[PDB]
Amino acid sequence: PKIHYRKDYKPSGFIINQVTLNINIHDQETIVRSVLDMDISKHNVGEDLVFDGVGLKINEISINNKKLVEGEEYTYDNEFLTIFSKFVPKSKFAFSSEVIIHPETNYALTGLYKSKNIIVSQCEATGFRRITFFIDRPDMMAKYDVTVTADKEKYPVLLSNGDKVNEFEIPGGRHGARFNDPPLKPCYLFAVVAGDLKHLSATYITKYTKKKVELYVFSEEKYVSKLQWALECLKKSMAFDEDYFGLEYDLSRLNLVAVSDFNVGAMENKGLNIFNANSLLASKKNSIDFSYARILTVVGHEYFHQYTGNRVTLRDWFQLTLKEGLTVHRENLFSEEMTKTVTTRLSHVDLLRSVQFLEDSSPLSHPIRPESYVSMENFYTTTVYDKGSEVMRMYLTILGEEYYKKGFDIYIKKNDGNTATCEDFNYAMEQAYKMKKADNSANLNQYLLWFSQSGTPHVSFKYNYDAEKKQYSIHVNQYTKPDENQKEKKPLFIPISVGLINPENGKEMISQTTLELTKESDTFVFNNIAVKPIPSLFRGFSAPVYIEDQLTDEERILLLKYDSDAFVRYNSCTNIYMKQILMNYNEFLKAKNEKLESFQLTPVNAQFIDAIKYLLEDPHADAGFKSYIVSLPQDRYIINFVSNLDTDVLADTKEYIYKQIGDKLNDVYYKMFKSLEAKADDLTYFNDESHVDFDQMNMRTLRNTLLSLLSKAQYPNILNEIIEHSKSPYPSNWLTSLSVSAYFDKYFELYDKTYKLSKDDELLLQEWLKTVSRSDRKDIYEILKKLENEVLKDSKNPNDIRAVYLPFTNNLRRFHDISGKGYKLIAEVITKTDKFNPMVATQLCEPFKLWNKLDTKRQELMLNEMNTMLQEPQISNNLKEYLLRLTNK
Ligand SMILES: O=C(N[C@@H](C(=O)NO)c1ccc(-c2cc(F)c(F)c(F)c2)cc1)C1CCOCC1
Ligand SMILES: [Mg+2]
Ligand SMILES: [Mg+2]
Ligand SMILES: [Mg+2]
Ligand SMILES: [Mg+2]
Numbered sequence: 001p002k003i004h005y006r007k008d009y010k011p012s013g014f015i016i017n018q019v020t021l022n023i024n025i026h027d028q029e030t031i032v033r034s035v036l037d038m039d040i041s042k043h044n045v046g047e048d049l050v051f052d053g054v055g056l057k058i059n060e061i062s063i064n065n066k067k068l069v070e071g072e073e074y075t076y077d078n079e080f081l082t083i084f085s086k087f088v089p090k091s092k093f094a095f096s097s098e099v100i101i102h103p104e105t106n107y108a109l110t111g112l113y114k115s116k117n118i119i120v121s122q123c124e125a126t127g128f129r130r131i132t133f134f135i136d137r138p139d140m141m142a143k144y145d146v147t148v149t150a151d152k153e154k155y156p157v158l159l160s161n162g163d164k165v166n167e168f169e170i171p172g173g174r175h176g177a178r179f180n181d182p183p184l185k186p187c188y189l190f191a192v193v194a195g196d197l198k199h200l201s202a203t204y205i206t207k208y209t210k211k212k213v214e215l216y217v218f219s220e221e222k223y224v225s226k227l228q229w230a231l232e233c234l235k236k237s238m239a240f241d242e243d244y245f246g247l248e249y250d251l252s253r254l255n256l257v258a259v260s261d262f263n264v265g266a267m268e269n270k271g272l273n274i275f276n277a278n279s280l281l282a283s284k285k286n287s288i289d290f291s292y293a294r295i296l297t298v299v300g301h302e303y304f305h306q307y308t309g310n311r312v313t314l315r316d317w318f319q320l321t322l323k324e325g326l327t328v329h330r331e332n333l334f335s336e337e338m339t340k341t342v343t344t345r346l347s348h349v350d351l352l353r354s355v356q357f358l359e360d361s362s363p364l365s366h367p368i369r370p371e372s373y374v375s376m377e378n379f380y381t382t383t384v385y386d387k388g389s390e391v392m393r394m395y396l397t398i399l400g401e402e403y404y405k406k407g408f409d410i411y412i413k414k415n416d417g418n419t420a421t422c423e424d425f426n427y428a429m430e431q432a433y434k435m436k437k438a439d440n441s442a443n444l445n446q447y448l449l450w451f452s453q454s455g456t457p458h459v460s461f462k463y464n465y466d467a468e469k470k471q472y473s474i475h476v477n478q479y480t481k482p483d484e485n486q487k488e489k490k491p492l493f494i495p496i497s498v499g500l501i502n503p504e505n506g507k508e509m510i511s512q513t514t515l516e517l518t519k520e521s522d523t524f525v526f527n528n529i530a531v532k533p534i535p536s537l538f539r540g541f542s543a544p545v546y547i548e549d550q551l552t553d554e555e556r557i558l559l560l561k562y563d564s565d566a567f568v569r570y571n572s573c574t575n576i577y578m579k580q581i582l583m584n585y586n587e588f589l590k591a592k593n594e595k596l597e598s599f600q601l602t603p604v605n606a607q608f609i610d611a612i613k614y615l616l617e618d619p620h621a622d623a624g625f626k627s628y629i630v631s632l633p634q635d636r637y638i639i640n641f642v643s644n645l646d647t648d649v650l651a652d653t654k655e656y657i658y659k660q661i662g663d664k665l666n667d668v669y670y671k672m673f674k675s676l677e678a679k680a681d682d683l684t685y686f687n688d689e690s691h692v693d694f695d696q697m698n699m700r701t702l703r704n705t706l707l708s709l710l711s712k713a714q715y716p717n718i719l720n721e722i723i724e725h726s727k728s729p730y731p732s733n734w735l736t737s738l739s740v741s742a743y744f745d746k747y748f749e750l751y752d753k754t755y756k757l758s759k760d761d762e763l764l765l766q767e768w769l770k771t772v773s774r775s776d777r778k779d780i781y782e783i784l785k786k787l788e789n790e791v792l793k794d795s796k797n798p799n800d801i802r803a804v805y806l807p808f809t810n811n812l813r814r815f816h817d818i819s820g821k822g823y824k825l826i827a828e829v830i831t832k833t834d835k836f837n838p839m840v841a842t843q844l845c846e847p848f849k850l851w852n853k854l855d856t857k858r859q860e861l862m863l864n865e866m867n868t869m870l871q872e873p874q875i876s877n878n879l880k881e882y883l884l885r886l887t888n889k
């Protein structure tokens with residue numbers, strides 16, 4: 001079980017300068033011939049030449065056109081090809097090989113595989129070695145010359161990286177295309193695609209050099225009408241990188257390709273980006289609203305990689321967050337600017353503080369730059385991506401836009417065309433910091449702890465105001481809990497964006513201010529503060545931390561109503577909810593533990609409910625924001641605050657609080673649901689696939705949120721509204737009608753209707769599956785069994801499997817049934833999936849991540865299933881490594 005250590009990085013004893021490939025796709029096998037033009041590096045010490053090569057069938061191998069013979073000159077063990085040093089040349093040489101691989105049966109979707117009728121590759125992180133022999137690490141940079149041949153009727157469209165330089169006919173109904181890609185690249189950016197693809201195309205003219213760039217977006221013929229939004233998003237992405245960062249695309253063509261079978265969202269192969277269909281294809285008739293923001297962010301994300309990851313690449317895989325954290329940060333800047341809605345930033349924070357905070361307090365906790373790995377396929381985590389992005393975003397907060405842009409350009413100009421490490425980025429930012437501080441002794445050495453230290457900091461506050469002195473103080477403390485990675489945690493460089501709100505008129509009392517907390521604690525003093533303020537802390541969520549604001553609910557309400565910052569208003573609301581949840585949770589727990597015949601519950605703060613009404617009734621307030629304030633905090637956010645969480649008692653707690661608020665506000669909810677209809681469901685642009693209105697989508701989100709609240713409440717005659725909603729042309733609406741109808745006798749009527757609307761579009765059917773999976777149904781186990789037998793069957797499509805099972809696992813009452821039947825069901829699915837796709841099997845483990853946070857009976861039930869999975873003789877390396885770490889074994 002080999003463990004790779006970050007401290008152990010050493011350059012290769014070899015160099016690969018040129019790769020020349022011939023990939024010949026046939027009915028039952030694919031033959032791959034490769035010539036590697038190689039050299040001996042300055043670091044060479046006469047070692048054996050060892051290539052990565054996994055699952056390859058050797059037809060022959062040769063060095064300088066002399067055939068090597070197995071046993072005497074090389075060994076191959078299905079993982080490593082070892083050529084004994086005595087047979088390795090001591091200057092430039094050519095290594096060649098011919099191997100056979102089998103994309104048709106490659107269900108793990110790594111290396112070269114078949115997705116429906118499309119042949120496609122996925123080489124990040126170490127999948128290139130599943131295609132041919134190589135020294136498969138990102139610092140082995142080479143030029144590529146790639147020829148693909150295939151049956152012309154089955155596979156008329158052939159793509160790889162670089163320029164297509166020849167197209168030719170082959171006897172027996174075949175044809176070939178040659179692609180030459182002269183700029184150096186790492187092998188994880190190699191891609192090839194063959195299929196009967198249809199496309200939309202456009203020409204983009206770059207801002208400064210005025211280069212013509214051809215843009216192509218591809219899919220199977222059936223879905224070619226779902227490609228338009230993606231092409232628009234690509235145009236938008238190019239413009240943003242030009243306008244914000246001054247960066248233009250350097251190649252003459254960019255291809256985007258949708259495939260049905262994909263382990264993740266998309267992949268940034270140079271000039272040839274490959275997408276999960278659910279993150280590239282949409283139409284207003286056949287997609288829910290979420291698809292539109294999804295496609296925007298994922299097209300943007302892969303485009304921004306062309307600089308951050310492709311032109312500046314990675315020295316080694318421990319630097320992953322350097323390209324992923326930075327590209328998520330660039331993706332988020334882009335998405336905020338395109339959507340112009342405050343909920344975009346809020347949604348990022350909501351994700352981080354639920355899913356990533358849970359990971360960071362689990363046995364899986366790691367820093368954004370880990371010290372070791374076993375499985376690279378297990379390294380692509382919300383910590384590396386989303387905490388990485390918040391760490392990349394803090395540089396912008398600290399430096400401000402002008403010096404951030406200066407520092408970023410330093411990074412690009414200094415590292416363009418090369419590999420890089422996290423230190424290279426910190427160094428570029430540090431140079432800008434020196435300039436900003438007018439102080440060449442200033443440094444960001446402490447900032448590096450954000451890369452190495454695991455766990456979420458807790459930042460807490462105390463205040464003091466002297467009315468005679470007009471002097472205000474904010475005392476701040478930071479603390480990170482020790483974990484298995486560091487016994488002693490050090491203080492971080494924490495930027496705290498703050499305002500001070502005058503509680504009498506709601507106005508700002510100071511200019512924009514970012515406190516730089518660099519010690520365990522500090523006191524920040526403000527003079528000439530005319531009245532005692534309410535502090536507005538961590539505006540924009542300015543650091544990835546647990547915020548303990550120590551404000552009263554009266555103070556939080558004032559901020560919720562009158563503060564200028566969307567995040568602090570949302571966080572203030574969040575904190576009011578959490579105080580209530582923790583209080584009611586323990587009142588319910590106590591009643592349970594003590595077997596009480598009667599007891600009391602503390603009601604929801606009535607002034608809080610008044611503030612929600614006030615905001616809801618304000619026509620100038622944002623519909624997206626409104627949808628957040630009527631929703632309780634995510635279960636996975638709440639669990640970070642409760643030990644031995646009894647999920648039944650939490651379910652009862654949430655139910656009580658929702659009922660309290662609905663008992664006061666349901667008539668308001670209904671009135672709004674009706675008044676929002678005209679603008680929310682406006683059909684003016686329903687047949688214009690390039691017109692996307694994020695505000696209007698937020699109005700639909702608000703309506704569908706309100707409808708859910710009124711349905712759960714059995715508001716008088718709401719079923720009438722539900723039935724009319726099922727007739728809406730928008731899938732977000734008519735799928736909503738299915739899940740809110742769970743509380744009525746018409747659920748299976750709506751089940752059949754919406755199935756019939758969904759079944760003939762692959763992606764829509766998957767959205768229907770999710771809607772069913774997440775339905776609040778007492779018979780949800782019987783329903784899941786029906787989906788398995790009637791719709792899912794033995795599909796190996798990850799989208800299908802994830803759609804059926806993951807939403808169900810968020811069902812607090814049912815997934816966590818005290819019998820353990822839900823844990824048993826998901827473990828059976830994990831073990832089944834692990835036989836053919838270990839990466840997705842590990843994704844399906846996600847519900848188990850919080851296992852040691854639950855009540856002791858459920859900890860035991862979850863642990864039993866994980867140990868049962870660990871005992872399967874045929875368990876994959878991925879799944880074994882993951883469960884071993886998760887169960888602290
Ligand atoms: O699709 C996503 N991430 C991919 C990415 O960063 N694209 O630029 C991504 C790509 C490949 C992998 C990956 C890693 C492996 F080790 C592996 F075997 C594999 F098949 C894919 C994981 C995530 C996320 C979801 C969509 O928005 C971007 C984040
Ligand atoms: Mg094989
Ligand atoms: Mg422009
Ligand atoms: Mg994203
Ligand atoms: Mg299918």
Ligand SMILES: [Zn+2]
Nearest residue numbers: 301305324327
């Ligand atoms: Zn990425």
